[PDB]
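User: Second chain of the day. Same drill as before.
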Amino acid sequence: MDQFLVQIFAVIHQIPKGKVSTYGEIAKMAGYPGYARHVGKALGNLPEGSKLPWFRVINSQGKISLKGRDLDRQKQKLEAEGIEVSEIGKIALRKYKWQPLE
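Assistant: Same format as last time:
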C-alpha cells in the first residue's frame, strides 16, 4: 500500500461521526503539502462503503468533490452521519468542520 495513502488515510480515521474536514488539512497532517487534490483522488478511488470513512473529507469551498451519482453517494453516507447536505452537494464547514477538541 502506497505510503502517501497510508499517511492521509491514517489521519482521516481520527474524524468522528458527523464531522467533515478539508483535503488541505488532511494533507498537512499527513505531511504532504500541495497533495490536497491527491487525497481527493484516493477517496474517490475507494468503494462506496469501505472500512475507511471517505465521505468525511470535502473541499475548502464546503462542497462535495464527487459529482453525479458519486455526489449523492457521499451525500447519502453523510445523511447517515447526520449532516445537512444541500441538494447541489453543499455543506456548512463553519459548523461541520472536524475539530479533534471534543
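The chain has one domain: 1-102.

User: Great, on to the next one.
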